[PDB]
Amino acid sequence: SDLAVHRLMLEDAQRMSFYRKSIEQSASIEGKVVVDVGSGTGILSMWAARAGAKHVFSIEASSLSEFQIGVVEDNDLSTKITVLGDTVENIIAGGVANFVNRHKAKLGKCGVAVLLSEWMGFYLFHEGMLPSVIRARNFFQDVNAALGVLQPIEMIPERATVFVAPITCKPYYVQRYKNFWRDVDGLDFSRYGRIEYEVYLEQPLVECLPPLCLLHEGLSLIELNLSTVQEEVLTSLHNTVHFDLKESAEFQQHAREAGSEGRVSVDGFTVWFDVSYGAHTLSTSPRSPSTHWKQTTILLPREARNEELVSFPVEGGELGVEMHISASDKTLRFYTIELELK
Amino acid sequence: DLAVHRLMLEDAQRMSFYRKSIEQSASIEGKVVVDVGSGTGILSMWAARAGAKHVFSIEASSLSEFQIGVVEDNDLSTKITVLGDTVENIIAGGVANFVNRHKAKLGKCGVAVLLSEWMGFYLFHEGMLPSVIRARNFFQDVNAALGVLQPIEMIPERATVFVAPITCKPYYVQRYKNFWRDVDGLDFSRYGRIEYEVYLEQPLVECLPPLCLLHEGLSLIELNLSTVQEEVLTSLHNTVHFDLKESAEFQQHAREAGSEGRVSVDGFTVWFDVSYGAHTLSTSPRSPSTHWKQTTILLPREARNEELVSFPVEGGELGVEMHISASDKTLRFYTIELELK
Ligand SMILES: Nc1ncnc2c1ncn2[C@@H]1O[C@H](CSCC[C@H](N)C(=O)O)[C@@H](O)[C@H]1O
Ligand SMILES: Nc1ncnc2c1ncn2[C@@H]1O[C@H](CSCC[C@H](N)C(=O)O)[C@@H](O)[C@H]1O
């Protein structure tokens, strides 16, 4: 069932394709030393080896680490990949010198060139492992310093962005509920549709939203440089974005349906992320191919939704919002999304 | 919970069986129908569309209140009465009280047909059969009070539990080995065995590939829905004997095993059929998938991997005793136990 979740991630072709391409394009992998943080099945470790890495350290805390040793052996890669079955944090606690002392023969004169990881949670942050990736990065930079090696570590992915967009719920309601319930062998069961829908919204909605829900193409909220981001940043994630709904292609879709006296109402905001390396981008936008992340949608209170308290004339208007991504405890792995309209 | 109801309304097999039985039945038009556990009221509204004189729609949950609106939204309010109550509570009100409250709708003929979708997993588990039995008996008392002794037509009229021995290999191959064998040139097939084995130890409810059958299946338990009583649901067991020497399904695997070979048995799969007139609703692996899927009981992993239950390629005899036993007093929840011999 651990493996069932990993199988989900391995079936994510967009996810798989971004990492395979990024790894094959790095000029820092061949002949150099790679660390894979949170390696799971070891797929990224094994890709790095095939790409000609000198040696790979594959770090995995769970009991998958023991089976990964077997699969590495089954793929004849046991000399190029070392599995470390422990948390990043416990490896760190063992210290810089002890790391170098245990694996010096594999490190040789080279140090760590590349840090591979797939840490992204929902909107990058929620149920992710970014804080462990940051700790790993800082630790291996100290390991490099102790080896007298001064080259900075390549992060893959190297950059991450959070995107936000205002939505109307109508097309999600119509496509996922009303379309089915309105005609059940010629019977009108649409009253049941309103019910099923209203109660599912009172579950942070994590679902693949039809793109027609977008009232605007989306704006950047938070952007990260993965070589420089520090834990401190995860304590104050907030920004204010301004959606120009005038002359927005997305808004016009709905403006045409409203009629000349009609109004288009905002029911909430949907949130997604991109990460990138070199020429490659992995996107979880509703406009991109589906991924196991889907998107995360934050709704306005039902009072605001049903009475359409946030609405716009057919010509559009301006929509400002301040959004907070707030840690709900001290791990910085769990977050809540809070917003206030301008 | 309407999401579970959508799932049942999206089950094309389940829906066509009931739509066809109701629209092809000769006891509905001009007659009085009871829908026991009506939920959305689909079976009731179908009964009204088929020309029923009147329909009593019984639904215990708060769906009943919305069902009234939907009966109205489809212009059927004179033809369908929603009784938002448990079957058991309506019975407790007594016969004479029912007859007096609804005397004009019963008319002179009383209840002719009792519609219901009560089937759980392997017919019994998380099903609603005891309420259907109680309803049937109650409305036959109502009929008797009106001088009608004609027995009530049950839809479905019959139900059968089937069992068949299976091999796990094709399920392993199709749902595990095929994916894990090559992940971009990597052999992750070790992960495949682990995911598979660990999933088996967590009553397997799943769509088994038809190639898993070592035999077409035999009847374990058969019910006449006009006559079945609650007492029967406390002692459900039987013994079936599979002649694998005469099974086409076994011969299939015997050929793949080759002239020198053994065919191994990894467990038993259980499904059900219900029927009415010319129509059968089947949840067999050889039939289109339904939300019931099938239920599979595996032999101990020791037996499976050491192939402790096996047959030479010409076949042999496989006898098994099965118990379907209620795990509490509701007669809604059950476990399946089996012994080879
Ligand atoms: N602090 C930590 N130290 C070591 N492993 C960790 C960790 N936090 C999470 N993990 C592991 O990191 C993995 C992230 S899922 C990523 C799996 C794999 N790299 C892939 O791309 O397919 C999980 O297997 C989890 O067990
Ligand atoms: N003892 C009981 N008395 C009245 N309603 C019951 C009941 N037990 C279960 N129900 C209701 O019966 C329904 C059965 S599932 C819905 C069946 C519906 N006729 C269909 O074929 O789609 C559920 O809505 C449940 O709430």
Numbering used by the authors:
A (entry chain B): 25 to 227, 230 to 368
B (entry chain A): 26 to 227, 230 to 368
Paper excerpt:
The set of protein arginine methyltransferases (PRMTs) is a family of enzymes that catalyze the transfer of a methyl group from S-adenosyl-L-methionine (SAM) to the guanidino nitrogen of an arginyl residue to produce S-adenosyl-L-homo-cysteine (SAH) and methyl arginyl residues. TbPRMT6 is the homologue of HsPRMT6 in T. brucei with 31% amino acid identity. The overall monomeric structure of TbPRMT6 consists of three parts: a SAM-binding domain (residues 36–181, blue), a dimerization arm (residues 193–225, yellow), and a β-barrel domain (residues 182–192 and residues 230–368, green). The structures of TbPRMT6 highlight several structural features that are distinct from those found in previously characterized type I PRMTs, including four stretches of insertion, the absence of the β15 strand, and a unique dimerization arm.
To investigate the structural basis for the unique properties of TbPRMT6, we report the crystal structures of apo-TbPRMT6 and its complex with the methylation product SAH (SAH-TbPRMT6); these structures were refined at 2.20 Å and 2.35 Å, respectively. We primarily describe the structure of SAH-TbPRMT6 unless otherwise noted. The SAH molecule is enveloped in the deep pocket of the SAM-binding domain formed by the helixes αY, αZ, αA, αB, αC, and αD, and the strands β2, β3, and β4. (i) For the adenine ring moiety, the main-chain amide of V112 (helix αC) interacts with nitrogen N1, and the carboxyl group E113 (helix αC) and the hydroxyl group of S156 (helix αD) make a hydrogen-bond network with the amino group of the adenine ring of SAH. (ii) For the ribose moiety, the carboxyl group of E84 (strand β2) and the imidazole ring of H30 (helix αY) create hydrogen bonds with the two ribose hydroxyls. Upon SAH binding, the guanidine group of R39 moves inwards ∼3.9 Å, forming a hydrogen bond network with the carboxyl group of SAH, the backbone carbonyl of M33 of helix αY, and the carboxyl group of E142. The imidazole ring of H318 swings ∼5 Å to make a hydrogen bond with the carboxyl group of D36 of helix αY, and this hydrogen bonding interaction induces a 1.8-Å movement of the carboxyl group of D36. SAH binding appeared to fix the active site residues of TbPRMT6 in conformations that are favorable for substrate binding. Taken together, our structural observations and biochemical results suggest that SAH binding induces rearrangements of the active site that promote the substrate binding of TbPRMT6, thereby supporting an ordered mechanism in which a cofactor binds to the active site before the arginine substrate.
